[PDB]
């Protein structure tokens, strides 16, 4: 239920994890 804010090679997404 956690989202995070993901970058990884310029790509950003907001990944939520539970």
């Given at each position: 239920k ?5 970058c990884?090679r ?7 994890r539970?």
């Amino acid at each position: 239920k956690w989202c995070f804010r993901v970058c990884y090679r310029g790509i950003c997404y907001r990944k939520c994890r539970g």
